Design a protein around this ligand. Structure first.
Ligand code: ADP
Ligand code: MG
Ligand code: MG
Length: 416
């Protein structure tokens, strides 16, 4: 369950050392930070701890995929300690490791108010439990070593806080291996739990899911689970052409087509009919002569077909209208996946227009939840983060929740 978890607001931190797992996996260009959003996002949990009299806050995270080898020239967290000091108005001590005797001593009984940032957890194979050696071979971590790694992390605080939703789908040492009596979700995780519980357990009605993406076959469990919960579903993006080819015999040109997904389209429509779910597919398209930002563009409908050579890379104006009609009926919306190639301006109108409708919906009291990854990227690109109810901080984690799975990092949190 998402509803029965201990959170930071209910956790007594006064005089306690707080070991906190954060998401500082920020985008980099040669170990310099291009977007600090994820660092700003953790600040409320850190300041709460400091303001409520925590003895220390020890921050642990990963960055990139070092795959269990130390790579401090390429994937060090050191630049984050500088960024964090800017954002907190407080000195941040950066340590060049995250476990072992020197780190445990630094963290044993620090001065009241101390903020410490540890080096990349994924420099140790014991964090993910497997990785690659410098020859590129697979290695798995050894049990006794995983135990020692976990025990060393657990020394660094008296209580544990997880504010890294983006890793909560992974049974990694920092997510599930910290052995302290109280394990609480921080304020980012609290928001994720609150919104996705509402969504998956007791949504407002009508509940609309907006699903986009390239393939059908890798989204079958997502679609199937959402068909158990929703009243309406928009299917957009590249995956729509598989549905349209199968159901209408549409000529789709060089548009994405999922041969294995094609074999289950009617099975999905069948379940939608059985559950009384209204499916809204697109009816018109912006076409491209190739998969390129500066492609020549055209227009098509289902009735016209797409010319051979050409591909549908966005929905068209009548599709936007049908999509807006479903948004207008909704009292709750989950949106996972853009409805066209939003990275390229010529193919971004459908996604921007739908975002405008979703913002207007929120204004009139719709609960609007944006999945992590590409849909969240659109909100940042068009500055709509504060104009929807919730923008999830974890792509892979939000997708696994929406598929109906239990997240090992959430499960590891204390109950009540
Ligand atoms: N009509 C389309 N044709 C091809 N690609 C598309 C289309 N609509 C959206 N996309 C692209 O699909 C990509 C993501 O699809 P997918 O990889 O299944 O989802 P995710 O990124 O969430 O894993 C995005 O980069 C987006 O630009
Ligand atoms: Mg997608
Ligand atoms: Mg895909």
């Amino acid at each position: 369950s998402l509803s029965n978890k201990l959170t930071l607001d209910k956790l007594d931190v006064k005089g306690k050392r707080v070991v906190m797992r954060v998401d500082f996996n920020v985008p980099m260009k040669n170990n310099q930070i291009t977007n600090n959003q994820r660092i700003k996002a953790a600040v409320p949990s850190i300041k709460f701890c400091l303001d409520n009299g925590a003895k220390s806050v020890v921050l642990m995270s990963h960055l990139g995929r070092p795959d269990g080898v130390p790579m401090p020239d390429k994937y060090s967290l050191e630049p984050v300690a500088v960024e964090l000091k800017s954002l907190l108005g407080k000195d941040v001590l950066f340590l060049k490791d995250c476990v072992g005797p020197e780190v445990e001593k630094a963290c044993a009984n620090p001065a009241a108010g101390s903020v410490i940032l540890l080096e990349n957890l994924r420099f140790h194979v014991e964090e993910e439990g497997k990785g690659k050696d410098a020859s590129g071979n697979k290695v798995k971590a050894e049990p006794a070593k995983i135990e020692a790694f976990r025990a060393s992390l657990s020394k660094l605080g008296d209580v544990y806080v997880n504010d890294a939703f983006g890793t909560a789908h992974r049974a990694h040492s920092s997510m599930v291996g910290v052995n302290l009596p109280q394990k609480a979700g921080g304020f980012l995780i609290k928001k994720e739990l609150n919104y996705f519980a509402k969504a998956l357990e007791s949504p407002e009605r009508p509940f609309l899911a907006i699903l986009g993406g390239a393939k059908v076959a890798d989204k079958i469990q997502l679609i199937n689970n959402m068909l158990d919960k929703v009243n309406e579903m928009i299917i957009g993006g590249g995956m729509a052409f598989t549905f349209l080819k199968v159901l209408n015999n549409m000529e789709i040109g060089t548009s994405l087509f999922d041969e294995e997904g094609a074999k289950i389209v009617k099975d999905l429509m069948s379940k939608a009919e059985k559950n009384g779910v209204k499916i809204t597919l697109p009816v018109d398209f912006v076409t491209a002569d190739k998969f390129d930002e500066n492609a020549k563009t055209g227009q098509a409908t289902v009735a016209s077909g797409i010319p051979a050579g050409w591909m549908g890379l966005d929905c068209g104006p009548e599709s936007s209208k049908k999509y807006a009609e479903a948004v207008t009926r909704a009292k709750q919306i989950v949106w996972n996946g853009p409805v066209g190639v939003f990275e390229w301006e010529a193919f971004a109108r459908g996604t921007k227009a739908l975002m405008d409708e979703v913002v207007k919906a929120t204004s009139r009291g719709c609960i609007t939840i944006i999945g992590g990854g590409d849909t969240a990227t659109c909100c940042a690109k068009w500055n709509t983060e504060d104009k929807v109810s919730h923008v999830s901080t974890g792509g892979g984690a939000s997708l696994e929740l929406l598929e109906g799975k239990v997240l090992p990092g959430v499960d590891a949190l204390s109950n009540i």
